[PDB]
Structures are given as C-alpha cells and as structure tokens.
Design a protein around this ligand. Structure first.
Ligand SMILES: CN[C@@H]1C[C@H]2O[C@@](C)([C@@H]1OC)n1c3ccccc3c3c4c(c5c6ccccc6n2c5c31)C(=O)N[C@@H]4O
Length: 173
C-alpha cells in the first residue's frame, strides 16, 4: 500500500503552470536532513548554495543554474530538470545517476522543500530553500514541522551559513 506519510506541512501536490511560475527565479539552500547516508555525506560539506529556476512549460523542463560553496570555493553547474506534472516531482541526472524529488510547499509563500525518497522509511528526507539566503524563525519552524512527519530529529539537520558563501561576488562579471 501507499508509503508516503502525509501530515500538515508534508503534502505532495501536482505541478501546474501556476507552480512553475511560483518557483521561477533565485532560491537559496537553507537546511536539510535525510535518513539516506549518501545524501547526508554530500550535503554535510555544503557551506552555501543558491540557484536559478527557468521553467519551459511546453517542454516540461526547468533550466537550472547552481552556485555552490564548499571547501571555501565557488562551484557552478547548469542542467535541465524534467518535470512530472501529475506526480508533482522533478528529476535530474547528476553524478551518474537519476534523482527524483517531490516539490513541496509550506504556509509561507517564499519557501519550498524537496522531498527525497519519500516512499522509503530507510532513506527519506527533506531539503529546505527560500527566496533569501536566511529565513525567519517562523519560516524555519515550518520545515521543522515537516521533518516531524518523517520522524527525523532536529539534531540531524545540517545548515548553510551565508557568511561563508563565495559565489555571489563571482556570479556576474
Ligand atoms: C542532486 N541533488 C540532490 C538530489 C535532490 O536533493 C538534494 C538534497 C541532493 O543534493 C544532495 N539537493 C540539494 C542539496 C543541497 C543543496 C542543493 C540541492 C539541490 C538542488 C536541486 C535538486 C533537485 C532537482 C531535481 C531532483 C532532485 C533534486 N535534488 C536537488 C538538490 C535543484 O534543482 N537545485 C538545487 O541546487
């Protein structure tokens, strides 16, 4: 039977053209937690990350430009996401493998989450993003609410530190 636990702030919803408009623009990676060992190992080294979404509605794709600071250096990538409208997921090929994430929303309109491996209690997790590099306490509290649905302790959360970003001064020029 169905395996994804639904709770107040963890609700998959179909991606529409209104959804694609809402996620168009620049986003900042704020925090995440997973039961999946590989994702935990990767994201624990991330100091900062921001990225740009540019949807192509007719082709069911999103153009992605990523600016990630780790090891005190700026690293860049561009690629295309595939959009699964009815499933409410996006997918990409990265690191020689496919990734799929549920696009998830909270009550505050300027944040969003990616749900990873949500049908797998051994591996599930959430990553949290906002339209500014730092969120308010109440904004972050919604992410903690969603994490409670996956029964992951807040002590497992990894956070970016915007003071450590190296990409912003380099993105243009
Ligand atoms: C490939 N990225 C991985 C799979 C999934 O979630 C993670 C958490 C994973 O990164 C470990 N993840 C991040 C973690 C830390 C900072 C940024 C990201 C990020 C972005 C994206 C995606 C993504 C798009 C489609 C399917 C799965 C996805 N995942 C991510 C991202 C993205 O599109 N932009 C972000 O930089």
């Amino acid at each position: 039977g169905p395996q994804i636990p639904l709770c107040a702030n963890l609700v998959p919803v179909p991606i529409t053209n209104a959804t694609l408009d809402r996620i168009t623009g620049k986003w900042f990676y704020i925090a995440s937690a997973f039961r999946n060992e590989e994702y935990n190992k990767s994201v624990q080294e991330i100091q900062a990350t921001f990225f740009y979404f540019t949807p192509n509605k007719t082709e069911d794709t999103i153009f992605l430009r990523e600016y990630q600071t780790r090891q005190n250096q700026c690293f860049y990538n561009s690629s295309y996401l595939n959009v699964q409208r009815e499933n409410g997921t996006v997918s990409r090929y990265e690191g020689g493998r496919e990734h799929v994430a549920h696009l998830l929303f909270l009550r505050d309109t300027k944040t969003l989450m990616f749900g990873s491996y949500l049908d797998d209690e051994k591996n599930w997790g959430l990553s949290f993003y906002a339209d500014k590099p730092e969120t308010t306490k109440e904004q972050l509290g919604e992410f903690y609410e969603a994490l409670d649905c996956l029964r992951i302790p807040r002590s497992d959360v990894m956070y970016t530190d915007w003071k450590k970003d190296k990409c912003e001064p380099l993105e243009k020029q």
